[PDB]
Design an enzyme around this catalytic site. Structure first.
Site, PDB file in Angstrom:
ATOM      1  N   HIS A   1     -10.601  -7.278 -41.034  1.00 30.70           N
ATOM      2  CA  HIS A   1     -10.381  -8.039 -39.797  1.00 30.70           C
ATOM      3  C   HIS A   1     -11.578  -8.106 -38.850  1.00 30.70           C
ATOM      4  O   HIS A   1     -11.854  -9.163 -38.276  1.00 30.70           O
ATOM      5  CB  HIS A   1      -9.165  -7.505 -39.035  1.00 30.70           C
TER       6      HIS A   1
ATOM      7  N   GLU B   1      -9.953   0.189 -38.906  1.00 35.61           N
ATOM      8  CA  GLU B   1     -11.159  -0.414 -39.452  1.00 35.61           C
ATOM      9  C   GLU B   1     -12.421   0.170 -38.818  1.00 35.61           C
ATOM     10  O   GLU B   1     -13.405   0.406 -39.510  1.00 35.61           O
ATOM     11  CB  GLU B   1     -11.069  -1.935 -39.396  1.00 35.61           C
TER      12      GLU B   1
ATOM     13  N   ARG C   1      11.386  -5.222 -17.042  1.00 34.98           N
ATOM     14  CA  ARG C   1      11.164  -6.409 -16.226  1.00 34.98           C
ATOM     15  C   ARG C   1      12.327  -7.369 -16.433  1.00 34.98           C
ATOM     16  O   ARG C   1      12.704  -7.653 -17.575  1.00 34.98           O
ATOM     17  CB  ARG C   1       9.847  -7.092 -16.602  1.00 34.98           C
TER      18      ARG C   1
ATOM     19  N   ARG D   1       5.103  -1.112  -9.886  1.00 33.12           N
ATOM     20  CA  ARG D   1       6.411  -1.580 -10.327  1.00 33.12           C
ATOM     21  C   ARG D   1       7.565  -1.168  -9.422  1.00 33.12           C
ATOM     22  O   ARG D   1       8.673  -1.700  -9.552  1.00 33.12           O
ATOM     23  CB  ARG D   1       6.667  -1.140 -11.772  1.00 33.12           C
TER      24      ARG D   1
HETATM   25  C1  LIG Z   1       1.365  -4.484 -15.294  1.00 31.64           C
HETATM   26  C2  LIG Z   1       1.122  -4.129 -16.731  1.00 31.64           C
HETATM   27  C3  LIG Z   1      -0.129  -4.258 -17.295  1.00 31.64           C
HETATM   28  N1  LIG Z   1      -0.289  -3.933 -18.583  1.00 31.64           N
HETATM   29  C4  LIG Z   1       0.713  -3.488 -19.362  1.00 31.64           C
HETATM   30  O1  LIG Z   1       0.438  -3.219 -20.549  1.00 31.64           O
HETATM   31  N2  LIG Z   1       1.964  -3.330 -18.890  1.00 31.64           N
HETATM   32  C5  LIG Z   1       2.213  -3.638 -17.597  1.00 31.64           C
HETATM   33  O2  LIG Z   1       3.338  -3.516 -17.092  1.00 31.64           O
END
Ligand SMILES: Cc1c[nH]c(=O)[nH]c1=O
Ligand SMILES: Cc1c[nH]c(=O)[nH]c1=O
Ligand SMILES: Cc1c[nH]c(=O)[nH]c1=O
Ligand SMILES: Cc1c[nH]c(=O)[nH]c1=O
Ligand SMILES: Cc1c[nH]c(=O)[nH]c1=O
Ligand SMILES: Cc1c[nH]c(=O)[nH]c1=O
Lengths: 246, 245, 251, 244, 252, 245
Positions: free
Chosen positions: A7, A79, A167, A222
């Site tokens: 790859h 790799e 989410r 979050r």
């Molecule tokens: C905000 C955010 C950035 N990057 C990620 O991998 N997950 C997330 O929730």
């Protein structure tokens, strides 16, 4: 000059004896990271795998993107290992799940909650997705030297950006039972953050004699919102940590 | 006679402000560890839980045995936490599974393979049985100070001494499917050693805002033998405690 | 001298014993042995305190397991190596059914495997079931002593706290798996919580060893999370008399 | 740009309801160029997106990158923008002895050797393709006369151990996957690839239609690594025509 | 409604206050079992659910077939429970996996290895598929009274006759990874036998305040062969039937 | 003498048949057979009633499975031994979508595996997917007679009651696993509940056998728990069989 690996499109020669790789998720960040070091040279770009070589304290280092997620990460790491890399430092972006972690904070991962699938292709779930002690030490000590606001601890590493990170602002607005209430659970358990590659990276390295470290810059909190609005410390730290590990 | 906790036979007052406990598996080691510090006093002994208090750089330290295994460990850690302990350093014995890790070597656990049940009572299997960074650092630094052949890495933490560590020197001489060939698998994955409390200790601490470190002295090398036949490691755990007060 | 790594016992020490009474608490070993003929202390190492006594001419071992499947698995394995073929656990327990009173004696037919060590002997689908003869002897022994006795399923937990859905803890939290679990076991007619039977029963039933399980109810969880420290001894006395009488029937 | 990763707006799609989703961002333009009015929309990370027109209707071509995680992002964000039908066009390793390089494999459902599928539905839920999408792919294959096989695909979160490849750095395959290729072979599984379990599961459990087609680049009964398949691409475009 | 339940075609009235049911797998065995008791009468037959009622010690007793497997068993047991049955005695056929458990032997199950799906619809896997003590006792005593080479212990209860019992003499000749080498494993663990309903029956009863017992006649020894010999089945069946009826008598 | 242990059938009884229609209810076997040429009873043992008929000059088997994966797995296996390579299940089903009515015909593309027997053929990760040709034939058969038909995913449960989240039961209890499960399947677009397809589809798809699944809706679960397409679905399965010979 046929590629040694399927790859990445690289030969061992391209590494110039490098044994350490800095591995961002985003291919577009590879050149940027490489440019912070001496004699940066583009090696290859195939799929999500963009690779550059640079020099740090007279020693060759690789910068190579993993793409998002365990699967593409597992390809890059495998790799690169075939090519001769023995130490991997992931530099990523992350969503904080603790209220007092600020955007731009540097989060160093000691080990990861394995909310991924690829880690299971290297070790059963019982096996810890734990970072290498030397790598974690290098990151923490690098963080200390530059004086960036830094938190050290456990990270939840998810195979999805959306439901696996609970989410809800999505097409379906649904989160499967497994992940219903999961963020609060991780939060109560002192988990600092979510990202999407460390469980795979840490598990595959820790179970195959490879050293891995994991650091990320916070792009959203979050506890406040699912998606940040539009607008360095972690990258400075990953490069400085690499210096210590050569 | 009074106790603020159900098993340990200790009041918060007994701790004299202690925020760190050294937690060996063996009740008989408790006095030995306490003896390395100032003003060692026996506190209590109930079931597998023998506790002493001592002083280290003017700060109270608890030494309390866990007994063998996650369940009794979970009780000791929980009750010590209720009493005010926030940092736990386990000092154990261990079987090395790597050919070049010798008897007498000191092993510092970064994280554990969860071959236990009690860890699951604190966090799902996906959660890492990872040691606290400061505690692990203190143990590694302590090992340098005391002098020991030291290895740092992953430990397999088993709810059994026998089949879960793929021992065949047993009544049955057999091992359940899950554990057939398991030692060689962990060996191939770079796992250093087997012991019986770290998965529980590390998971329950990492998932509850408690700091835990894990160190053990190698008493057997499993590539060579099954049946074994801790001063270095005890000096190290005490020195580590000094760094974490 | 020891034939085994942890217990500090030899086959000679057993004097032909094929049955062991196995309490969790080392302090209970002497108490159990005191109900039998010419008890003598054998050894004490870690949580493993052992005595030998006789029941109508036959040697019997009393040996503590410590708390939990792991130490239980060591005691049982090493006793098996030494020649023990029948194990009777005598424990303390928290009842979860409203009309199982403190002081009641609970005989376990089989256990909910909320432990890890049982999995080191048999996959989860295998039943943590007691031996029929042992369970029979315990039930009969309960009638001989005259205790209020219940027979049924027991939840056997690797923890005292979250696995038994206790909330008065350092964290005050219970992991998702065990959130609402006590109500679920209650609804399924599970009698009680204890901490060794799943390991004991599974390891014995999958290795040709006979095991029985009895416990004295020291608390009822539908009125109290906390066991009363002063009422525990008299409550456990009934169950101890029963385990010894059961042993008499199994020799 | 409004969706977080793809950098696309609803307007960019110009009413498109179908997306062709290759793994490789570099294949996106190539696929778009086979249709009318190809226009680049955006390129961020592994997500390169183009718009084109097929029989007068707007269609999207958008790369997923390798693996369920990045796939799940692309599919979700495209769904947010109005895409309701997803056709994956991929590369694959055949594991049945008579499935040749260049053959076209249409997936009815996938063995879930991934993690992302579990973020949408528990393992008991089938990673099954949409009937109309699968039908369109099969009929498109028949129309161009390509050697085609229809059936089950093993969809793996790894290229290496999860596909029981041993020619690796460690040469180790975790217990779970030791002997797994032979097991899938005996079960009639046609092939390995790395996105379909996530794609099919996330769509089937969210009212989205998904189809899966791949061109065989290696046969695993012969060798592990493919020698360094426009039939499959022709088929996905023709299938898309039937799904507008 | 001429039925109080969806499948069985029975009313509470049909039970005449019965609180115990004998539950064979085979509808054809129902009348045979009923015929050993007082005042046997046919009740209903729908799908694999054939029901009769009889009397023992002046108490009504139901005999009702479950069909093969946990699913149909779970229906019969649930609907009988709705109608008032509180005690279930399964009488089945079984394959012995132990070398010294022989054709014609009678096996009383204390608890089952849960190689089924239906048990999981009542309790998580951790919960034991355990028989009721009184029922098990009655079966053991019954076996001892009427005469029978009897073994008491653990049974592997499988959702399949073939791969789940590691039978290889099949269309595919293959056994999925989970079950490859499984018979030897159960054998080493002292599991006596294979059958196909006890895990569901025992789990659903033990987790819902119902009593269940399990007895079976050995029709094949699996260390010898995969498919049972027809010649020894009839006698083995009637023998186990006498035991289950005698057990029922002791439980009323 | 029978070639198979349960069905009481010989290969000769099948007269070269390679397709079987497999209803759950033994009492519906003759009814399905009567829709074809030269129907004749073969055997009836336990829940396994079998007839042979003729369709376009080709022999076809109709054989009941009984309720559930276990008995289904017996019938399918033993029919496979006798030469059957295509299995079309025709069943009854409870709809869980409000847009599906009693008498509607549901063609299953794949099943949610809420059974146990499927696991005896393939691990859970394997899809309980229908054969493409069989599904196509059922869909096309459905379109030819103009029946109201839905195509998609079916939840296939080892129980009628708790696994379908029915609360109108003896216990009134549904085990944690299945609490809220109907709503979950509903949100995921699952059409219906039945009790044999997961086993049928998995065992066939993993053994080179072709399977299709069709059912008539006898209740809608958004309206009631217990039921009060008989001809439509049966006509469809027979017409589909015709296309698969
Ligand atoms: C905000 C955010 C950035 N990057 C990620 O991998 N997950 C997330 O929730
Ligand atoms: C030798 C040894 C000591 N302690 C353990 O916990 N396991 C072992 O194997
Ligand atoms: C009261 C009590 C005693 N012993 C246990 O193991 N658990 C309990 O809850
Ligand atoms: C050859 C090949 C290509 N792509 C995959 O995803 N897997 C494979 O094996
Ligand atoms: C012989 C036999 C009878 N009944 C079963 O359920 N399984 C078997 O193997
Ligand atoms: C109504 C109905 C029919 N058939 C089933 O298998 N389940 C159901 O709920």
């Amino acid at each position: 000059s046929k590629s040694d690996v399927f790859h990445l499109g690289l030969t061992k020669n391209d590494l110039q004896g490098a044994q350490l790789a800095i591995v961002p998720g985003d291919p577009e960040r590879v050149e940027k990271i490489a440019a912070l070091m001496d004699k940066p040279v583009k090696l290859a770009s195939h799929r999500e795998f963009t690779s550059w070589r640079a020099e740090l304290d007279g020693k060759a280092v690789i910068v190579c993107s993993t793409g998002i997620g365990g699967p593409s990460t597992s390809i890059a790491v495998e790799e690169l290992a075939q090519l001769g890399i023995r130490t991997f430092l992931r530099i990523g972006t992350t969503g904080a799940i603790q209220p007092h972690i600020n955007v731009g904070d540097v989060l160093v991962t000691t080990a990861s909650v394995r909310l991924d699938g690829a880690s299971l292709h290297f070790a059963p779930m019982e096996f810890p997705a734990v970072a290498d002690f030397a790598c974690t030490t290098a990151l923490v000590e690098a963080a200390k030297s530059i004086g960036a606001t830094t938190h050290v601890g456990v990270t939840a590493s998810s195979d999805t950006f959306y439901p696996g990170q609970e989410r809800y602002d999505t097409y379906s607005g649904r989160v499967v039972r497994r992940f219903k209430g999961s963020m609060e659970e991780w939060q109560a358990m002192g988990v600092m953050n979510y990202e999407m590659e460390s469980a795979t990276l840490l598990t595959m390295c820790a179970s195959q004699g490879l050293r891995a470290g994991m650091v990320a810059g916070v792009i959203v909190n979050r506890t406040q919102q699912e998606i940040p609005n539009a607008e360095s410390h972690a990258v400075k730290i990953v490069v400085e940590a690499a210096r210590r590990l050569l």
